[PDB]
Design an enzyme around this catalytic site. Structure first.
Site, PDB file in Angstrom:
ATOM      1  N   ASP A 406      35.979  25.562  70.310  1.00 59.01           N
ATOM      2  CA  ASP A 406      37.508  25.378  70.356  1.00 59.01           C
ATOM      3  C   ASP A 406      37.858  24.471  69.408  1.00 59.01           C
ATOM      4  O   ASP A 406      37.787  23.365  69.265  1.00 59.01           O
ATOM      5  CB  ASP A 406      38.099  25.146  71.652  1.00 59.01           C
ATOM      6  CG  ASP A 406      39.521  25.219  71.752  1.00 59.01           C
ATOM      7  OD1 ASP A 406      40.154  26.348  71.460  1.00 59.01           O
ATOM      8  OD2 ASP A 406      40.276  24.227  72.039  1.00 59.01           O
ATOM      9  N   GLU A 435      36.604  28.310  65.677  1.00 63.04           N
ATOM     10  CA  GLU A 435      37.791  28.543  64.805  1.00 63.04           C
ATOM     11  C   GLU A 435      37.974  27.283  64.004  1.00 63.04           C
ATOM     12  O   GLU A 435      38.432  26.332  64.352  1.00 63.04           O
ATOM     13  CB  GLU A 435      38.942  28.795  65.790  1.00 63.04           C
ATOM     14  CG  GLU A 435      39.047  27.805  67.067  1.00 63.04           C
ATOM     15  CD  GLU A 435      39.920  28.038  67.976  1.00 63.04           C
ATOM     16  OE1 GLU A 435      40.133  27.531  68.924  1.00 63.04           O
ATOM     17  OE2 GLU A 435      40.756  29.284  68.008  1.00 63.04           O
TER      18      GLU A 435
HETATM   19  O1  LIG Z   1      48.939  27.089  67.540  1.00 63.14           O
HETATM   20  C1  LIG Z   1      48.809  27.533  66.226  1.00 63.14           C
HETATM   21  C2  LIG Z   1      48.086  28.984  66.506  1.00 63.14           C
HETATM   22  O2  LIG Z   1      46.607  28.441  66.290  1.00 63.14           O
HETATM   23  C3  LIG Z   1      45.639  29.388  65.876  1.00 63.14           C
HETATM   24  O3  LIG Z   1      46.149  30.551  65.094  1.00 63.14           O
HETATM   25  C4  LIG Z   1      45.407  30.350  63.585  1.00 63.14           C
HETATM   26  C5  LIG Z   1      45.333  31.791  63.268  1.00 63.14           C
HETATM   27  O4  LIG Z   1      44.475  32.498  63.931  1.00 63.14           O
HETATM   28  C6  LIG Z   1      44.604  31.556  61.589  1.00 63.14           C
HETATM   29  O5  LIG Z   1      44.761  32.922  61.213  1.00 63.14           O
HETATM   30  C7  LIG Z   1      45.610  30.968  60.999  1.00 63.14           C
HETATM   31  O6  LIG Z   1      46.789  31.419  60.834  1.00 63.14           O
HETATM   32  C8  LIG Z   1      47.471  31.533  59.599  1.00 63.14           C
HETATM   33  C9  LIG Z   1      48.038  33.113  59.417  1.00 63.14           C
HETATM   34  O7  LIG Z   1      46.837  33.785  59.632  1.00 63.14           O
HETATM   35  C10 LIG Z   1      48.772  33.273  58.486  1.00 63.14           C
HETATM   36  O8  LIG Z   1      49.281  34.753  58.420  1.00 63.14           O
HETATM   37  C11 LIG Z   1      49.998  32.201  58.212  1.00 63.14           C
HETATM   38  O9  LIG Z   1      50.732  32.413  59.459  1.00 63.14           O
HETATM   39  C12 LIG Z   1      52.194  32.020  59.219  1.00 63.14           C
HETATM   40  C13 LIG Z   1      53.013  33.141  60.080  1.00 63.14           C
HETATM   41  O10 LIG Z   1      53.005  34.442  59.505  1.00 63.14           O
HETATM   42  C14 LIG Z   1      54.415  32.867  60.391  1.00 63.14           C
HETATM   43  O11 LIG Z   1      55.022  33.876  60.981  1.00 63.14           O
HETATM   44  C15 LIG Z   1      54.777  31.407  60.492  1.00 63.14           C
HETATM   45  O12 LIG Z   1      54.056  31.438  62.012  1.00 63.14           O
HETATM   46  C16 LIG Z   1      54.772  30.806  62.801  1.00 63.14           C
HETATM   47  C17 LIG Z   1      54.916  31.614  64.125  1.00 63.14           C
HETATM   48  O13 LIG Z   1      55.802  32.762  64.124  1.00 63.14           O
HETATM   49  C18 LIG Z   1      55.582  31.014  65.406  1.00 63.14           C
HETATM   50  O14 LIG Z   1      55.311  31.531  66.529  1.00 63.14           O
HETATM   51  C19 LIG Z   1      54.719  29.476  65.571  1.00 63.14           C
HETATM   52  O15 LIG Z   1      53.324  29.764  65.760  1.00 63.14           O
HETATM   53  C20 LIG Z   1      52.648  29.751  67.422  1.00 63.14           C
HETATM   54  C21 LIG Z   1      52.183  30.972  67.746  1.00 63.14           C
HETATM   55  O16 LIG Z   1      53.145  32.041  67.796  1.00 63.14           O
HETATM   56  C22 LIG Z   1      51.649  30.572  68.639  1.00 63.14           C
HETATM   57  O17 LIG Z   1      50.782  32.070  69.203  1.00 63.14           O
HETATM   58  C23 LIG Z   1      50.421  29.748  68.492  1.00 63.14           C
HETATM   59  O18 LIG Z   1      49.550  30.090  67.712  1.00 63.14           O
HETATM   60  C24 LIG Z   1      48.192  29.551  67.616  1.00 63.14           C
HETATM   61  C25 LIG Z   1      47.168  30.761  67.692  1.00 63.14           C
HETATM   62  O19 LIG Z   1      47.265  31.260  69.041  1.00 63.14           O
HETATM   63  C26 LIG Z   1      45.844  30.455  67.313  1.00 63.14           C
HETATM   64  O20 LIG Z   1      44.943  31.533  67.323  1.00 63.14           O
HETATM   65  O21 LIG Z   1      51.021  28.420  68.463  1.00 63.14           O
HETATM   66  C27 LIG Z   1      51.830  28.553  66.998  1.00 63.14           C
HETATM   67  C28 LIG Z   1      52.335  27.254  66.990  1.00 63.14           C
HETATM   68  O22 LIG Z   1      51.362  26.315  66.338  1.00 63.14           O
HETATM   69  O23 LIG Z   1      54.773  28.618  64.323  1.00 63.14           O
HETATM   70  C29 LIG Z   1      54.235  29.319  63.264  1.00 63.14           C
HETATM   71  C30 LIG Z   1      54.456  28.325  62.062  1.00 63.14           C
HETATM   72  O24 LIG Z   1      53.500  28.148  61.133  1.00 63.14           O
HETATM   73  O25 LIG Z   1      53.979  30.527  59.710  1.00 63.14           O
HETATM   74  C31 LIG Z   1      52.579  30.801  59.821  1.00 63.14           C
HETATM   75  C32 LIG Z   1      52.143  29.715  58.607  1.00 63.14           C
HETATM   76  O26 LIG Z   1      52.932  29.700  57.746  1.00 63.14           O
HETATM   77  O27 LIG Z   1      49.313  30.739  58.238  1.00 63.14           O
HETATM   78  C33 LIG Z   1      48.476  30.572  59.125  1.00 63.14           C
HETATM   79  C34 LIG Z   1      48.123  29.216  58.997  1.00 63.14           C
HETATM   80  O28 LIG Z   1      46.827  29.046  58.929  1.00 63.14           O
HETATM   81  O29 LIG Z   1      45.682  29.371  61.386  1.00 63.14           O
HETATM   82  C35 LIG Z   1      46.021  29.534  62.884  1.00 63.14           C
HETATM   83  C36 LIG Z   1      46.031  27.921  63.097  1.00 63.14           C
HETATM   84  O30 LIG Z   1      46.768  27.303  62.051  1.00 63.14           O
END
Ligand SMILES: OC[C@H]1O[C@@H]2O[C@H]3[C@H](O)[C@@H](O)[C@@H](O[C@H]4[C@H](O)[C@@H](O)[C@@H](O[C@H]5[C@H](O)[C@@H](O)[C@@H](O[C@H]6[C@H](O)[C@@H](O)[C@@H](O[C@H]7[C@H](O)[C@@H](O)[C@@H](O[C@H]1[C@H](O)[C@H]2O)O[C@@H]7CO)O[C@@H]6CO)O[C@@H]5CO)O[C@@H]4CO)O[C@@H]3CO
Ligand SMILES: [Ca+2]
EC number: 3.2.1.41
Length: 712
Positions: A406, A435
Site C-alpha cells: 500500500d 502503488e
Molecule cells: O488519495 C489520492 C488518490 O491516491 C490514489 O490515486 C492515484 C492514482 O491511481 C494515480 O493514477 C495517480 O493519479 C493521477 C491521475 O491518474 C491523473 O489523471 C491526475 O489526476 C488529476 C485528476 O484528473 C483531477 O480531477 C484532479 O483530481 C482531484 C480529484 O478530482 C479530487 O476528488 C481529489 O482526489 C481525491 C479522489 O477523489 C479520491 O478518490 C482519493 O484518490 C486516491 C485514489 O483512490 C488512489 O487510487 O483521494 C483524492 C485526494 O487525495 O483531489 C484531486 C486533486 O489532485 O487532479 C488530479 C491531479 O492533478 O494526476 C494524478 C496524480 O498522480 O496518483 C494518485 C495518487 O496521487
C-alpha cells in the site's frame, strides 16, 4: 493536558548540541554559562548562538563530549536553576542511527523454561515489562539497558498465555505500549500476548511461482467475500470461510473456494489481515473497514476470527485458510501498510522512540504525504529493519506468497531492495508490487519507491494507472471515458498496455519489463468499473454496459503483463455508486453472490479468457525483447484495435494468433493480413464451441472481442 513543572527547557537536537529554551520573563535570570550534569558528569556548554522566539529566548549550546543516552541528564543555568535534558531531533540523525542500530531480534523470545523480552529504546532512560494474565498474578519487572539502546529482561517460567506491555520512560514520562513485534494480542489489540510456537504444519508444498506474467491476481476482502447471506459459506466474514470446499449459492452456482479455483486465478490478494483499528472485535457487525489503520504489524486482525478473545485462535485460522488455499493450488498475497500507522501519537513506535519512526517536514512537524496523518520513515535504519523483519516473518510464520505494498511510493528504494533480497531468499518466486504513486513525502525524488524509478527496482511490480485509465477512462472524472467506453483518444495508450507498457513507438516505457506491470481496470479503491461506466454512460442500456466491461476484461487478460482482477469485477460488481467504500456497510461492500448467479454466463466468459491465457504462452511473453519479437499491431482506429502474436514456433501451440477489440455497437468487416484460413475462436457473442473457419475477412459485430488462430 497537565505536565511536569520545569524551570526552563533543554533538548538534545544533535549528538553534541543542546538547545536551551528559557521562558521570556526569565531571560535575565536563568542565564549562561550553562552546564551539563550527570552521575559524575558536570561539563561546560559553549553557546554557538542565541536568539529570541515568540515567548522564549533560545541558546544553541555545544558540548565537548557527545551526549550519553540512557542516563538522566541535567542542564544547570548560572542562576542555579536546572531541568532534565529531554530528547530533541537528535533521534533522526545519521550519527544517532549508526550508534544505536541493533541487528539482533526484538520482541518476546519464548522458551518453555523462560522468556527474554527485548525492546529498542535508545533515547529512553528506563524501561520495564508489564505482565498480566486472566485471573492470575500480574507482575512488572524493570528491564536492563544493554548495548545499542536495547532494554531486556529474562523472566523464568512458562509465559504462554501471558499478556505483556512495555513501559518506556522518555523525557521523564512513562508510557505504556504494546510490543512493536507482538506476534499475538488480546481482543482489540490492547495488549500483546506471549504464545509458544503453535507447531502449525504446512502440508501443501508449492513450487516457486514460475514468473509474474504467469499470475492472475484476484483482490478480495475477507468480510466482503462471504458475508452475503447467499454466499453458501458457514463462516461468513471469517478466515475459515475460504477453507470451506464445494460451497455453492442457493440456486446451485459455485461459490467461495470452489468458485475462486474455478475462475482460474492463481493468487488471492487479501486486504489487510494484520491487526487494525476500525472494527470493534467485540461487536464486529456494528462497523466495517478495509483495514488500512495499522495497529500491530506482526499480529492478525481479530474481527476475522471465530473468537477474537483467544490470542491463538486468529493465528490458527488464518494459517489454516492459507494452507487450505495452498492445498487447492491457490497462492496468497498480503496487502501490507508500511507507509503509516493509525494515530501516530499513541502508536507503539512513537511511545517507544518519540519522533524516530515518522518523517518530519523542514519545520519539525510530522509529514503527511500518505494523506492520512503520518508517513513512516522507512529510511531510518531500525524502521527498514522493522519492515524487512515483518515481511520475512509473514513469509516464514504464515507461509504467504507475496505482498501488495500500500502506497509503495512512500517507502525508500534502499529499504525496498533490502527487504526484497531477504524476502526472495526466504521464499523464491514471491510477488512483490504496489502503488508507486508519486506522493509529497519528505524524500529526494530518486529515493522514492515510485513508478518513475521502476528501472532501479527490478523484481518489483507497479499498478499500471496509465493502462487502467486508458481502458476505463480517467478515474478522477466521472464522465471521462476510455477506449472500452468508446473514446478513441486512448486507443494508442491501450495498444501500449497490450504490449506490456515497456515502450511503444513515440510512447515512453511505463516500466522496463512486463513482469513489473500490474494490469487492471478495477480495485477496492474508487468506483467499481460498473459504477464508473454507469456515470460516464448514463444513456447506455445494461446489455451494452456489460459488453463494455467484458471488453475491458479481454483487453487486460490478453495483454502482456500481470493481470489483476477485483473480486466481483467478473460479474459487474456494484457499490451503489459509492466511490470510497472504506467504512461503508456490508450492503455496500459485500460480494453479491446473487449477482454472480444472475451473470454466471458473463463470469464464464472471464473464466474462458483466463483459461485461454493459461493455455497459450503467446499472451505471456517474459520480456520486452520477446514482445518486440512476437507481437505486432495490425490496426489502430478509434473503436477498433487489432494486434497479432506471431513466430510462435516453440512458444505457443498455435502458429499465429489475431485479437481484435471493438468498442462500438456498429458492425464492420476486417481484412486479415493474409488469405490463409483461420479458426474463429471468439467474437462479440463469446467463445465458439466448434471454431468455424473464416478466410481473408471477418465480421466484427458490435462491442466485443474477436479472436482468430492458426494451428500448426
Ligand atoms: O488519495 C489520492 C488518490 O491516491 C490514489 O490515486 C492515484 C492514482 O491511481 C494515480 O493514477 C495517480 O493519479 C493521477 C491521475 O491518474 C491523473 O489523471 C491526475 O489526476 C488529476 C485528476 O484528473 C483531477 O480531477 C484532479 O483530481 C482531484 C480529484 O478530482 C479530487 O476528488 C481529489 O482526489 C481525491 C479522489 O477523489 C479520491 O478518490 C482519493 O484518490 C486516491 C485514489 O483512490 C488512489 O487510487 O483521494 C483524492 C485526494 O487525495 O483531489 C484531486 C486533486 O489532485 O487532479 C488530479 C491531479 O492533478 O494526476 C494524478 C496524480 O498522480 O496518483 C494518485 C495518487 O496521487
Ligand atoms: Ca482490530
Amino acid at each position: 493536558m497537565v505536565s511536569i513543572r520545569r524551570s526552563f527547557e533543554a533538548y538534545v537536537d544533535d549528538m553534541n548540541i543542546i538547545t536551551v529554551l528559557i521562558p521570556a520573563e526569565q531571560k535575565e535570570i536563568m542565564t549562561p554559562p550553562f552546564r551539563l550534569e550527570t552521575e559524575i558528569t558536570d561539563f561546560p556548554l559553549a553557546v554557538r548562538e542565541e536568539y529570541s522566539l515568540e515567548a522564549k529566548y533560545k541558546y544553541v549550546c555545544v558540548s565537548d563530549h557527545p551526549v550519553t543516552f540512557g542516563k538522566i541528564h541535567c542542564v544547570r543555568a548560572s542562576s542555579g536553576h536546572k531541568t532534565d535534558l529531554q530528547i530533541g531531533a537528535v533521534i533522526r540523525t545519521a550519527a544517532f542511527d549508526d550508534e544505536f542500530y541493533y541487528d539482533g531480534e526484538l520482541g518476546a523470545v519464548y522458551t518453555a523454561d523462560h522468556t527474554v523480552f527485548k525492546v529498542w529504546a535508545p533515547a529512553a532512560t528506563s524501561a520495564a515489562v508489564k505482565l498480566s494474565h486472566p485471573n492470575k498474578s500480574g507482575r512488572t519487572f524493570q528491564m536492563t539497558r544493554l548495548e545499542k539502546g536495547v532494554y531486556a529482561v529474562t523472566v523464568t517460567g512458562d509465559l504462554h498465555g501471558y499478556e505483556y506491555l512495555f513501559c518506556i520512560c522518555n523525557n521523564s514520562e512513562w508510557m505504556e505500549t504494546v510490543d512493536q513485534y507482538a506476534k499475538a494480542v488480546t481482543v482489540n489489540g490492547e495488549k500483546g500476548v506471549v504464545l509458544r510456537p503453535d507447531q502449525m504444519k504446512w502440508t501443501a508444498p508449492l513450487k516457486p511461482f514460475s514468473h509474474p506474467v504467469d499470475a492472475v491476481i484476484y483482490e478480495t476482502h475477507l468480510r466482503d467475500f462471504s458475508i452475503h447471506e447467499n454466499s453458501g459459506m458457514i463462516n461468513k466474514g471469517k478466515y475459515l470461510a475460504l477453507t470451506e470446499t464445494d460451497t455453492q449459492t442457493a440456486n446451485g452456482s459455485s461459490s467461495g473456494l470452489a468458485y475462486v479455483k474455478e475462475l482460474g486465478v492463481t493468487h488471492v490478494e487479501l486486504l489487510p489481515v494484520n491487526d487494525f483499528a476500525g472494527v470493534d472485535e467485540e461487536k464486529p457487525l456494528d462497523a466495517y473497514n478495509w483495514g488500512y489503520n495499522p495497529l500491530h504489524f506482526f499480529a492478525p486482525e481479530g474481527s476475522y476470527a471465530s473468537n477474537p478473545h483467544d490470542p491463538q485462535t486468529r493465528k490458527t485460522e488464518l494459517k489454516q485458510m492459507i494452507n487450505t488455499l495452498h492445498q487447492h493450488g491457490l497462492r496468497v498475497i498480503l496487502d501490507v501498510v508500511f507507509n503509516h500507522v493509525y494515530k501516530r501519537e499513541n502508536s507503539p513506535f512513537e511511545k517507544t522512540v518519540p519522533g524516530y519512526f515518522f518523517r518530519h517536514d523542514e519545520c519539525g512537524k510530522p509529514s503527511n504525504g500518505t494523506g492520512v496523518g503520518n508517513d513512516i520513515a522507512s529510511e531510518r535504519r531500525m524502521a527498514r529493519k522493522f519492515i524487512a523483519d515483518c515481511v520475512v516473518y509473514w513469509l516464514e510464520e504464515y507461509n504467504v506468497d507475496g505482498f501488495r505494498f500500500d502506497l509503495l511510493g512512500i517507502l525508500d528504494i534502499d529499504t525496498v531492495l533490502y527487504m526484497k533480497e531477504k524476502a526472495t531468499k526466504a521464499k523464491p518466486g514471491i510477488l512483490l508490487f504496489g502503488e508507486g504513486w508519486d506522493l509529497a513525502t519528505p524524500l529526494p525524488h530518486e529515493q522514492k519507491a515510485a513508478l518513475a524509478n521502476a528501472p532501479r527496482m527490478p523484481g518489483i511490480g507497479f499498478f499500471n494507472d496509465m493502462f487502467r485509465d486508458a481502458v476505463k477512462g480517467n478515474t478522477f472524472h466521472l464522465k471521462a471515458t476510455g477506449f472500452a467506453l468508446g473514446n478513441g483518444e486512448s486507443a494508442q495508450a491501450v495498444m501500449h498496455g497490450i504490449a506490456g507498457s515497456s515502450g511503444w513507438k513515440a510512447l515512453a516505457p511505463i516500466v522496463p519489463e512486463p513482469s513489473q506491470s500490474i494490469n487492471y481496470v478495477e480495485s477496492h479503491d474508487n468506483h467499481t468499473f460498473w459504477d464508473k461506466m454507469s456515470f460516464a454512460l448514463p444513456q447506455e442500456n445494461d446489455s451494452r454496459k456489460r459488453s463494455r466491461q467484458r471488453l475491458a476484461v479481454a483487453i487486460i487478460l490478453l495483454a502482456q503483463g500481470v493481470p489483476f482482477i477485483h473480486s466481483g469485477q467478473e460479474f459487474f460488481r456494484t457499490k451503489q455508486g459509492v466511490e470510497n467504500s472504506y467504512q461503508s456497510s456490508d450492503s455496500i461492500n459485500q460480494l453479491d453472490w446473487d449477482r454472480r448467479e444472475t451473470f454466471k454466463e458473463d463470469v464464464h466468459y472471464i473464466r474462458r479468457l483466463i483459461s485461454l491465457r493459461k493455455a497459450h504462452p503467446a499472451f505471456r511473453l517474459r520480456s520486452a525483447a520477446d514482445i518486440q519479437r512476437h507481437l505486432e499491431c495490425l490496426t489502430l482506429k478509434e473503436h477498433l484495435i487489432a494486434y497479432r502474436l506471431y513466430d510462435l514456433d516453440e512458444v505457443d501451440e498455435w502458429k499465429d494468433i489475431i485479437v481484435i477489440h471493438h468498442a462500438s455497437p456498429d458492425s464492420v468487416e476486417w481484412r486479415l493480413p493474409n488469405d490463409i484460413p483461420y479458426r474463429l475462436l471468439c467474437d462479440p457473442s463469446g467463445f465458439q464451441e466448434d471454431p468455424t473457419e473464416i478466410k481473408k475477412t471477418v465480421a466484427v459485430n458490435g462491442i466485443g472481442t474477436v479472436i482468430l488462430y492458426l494451428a500448426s
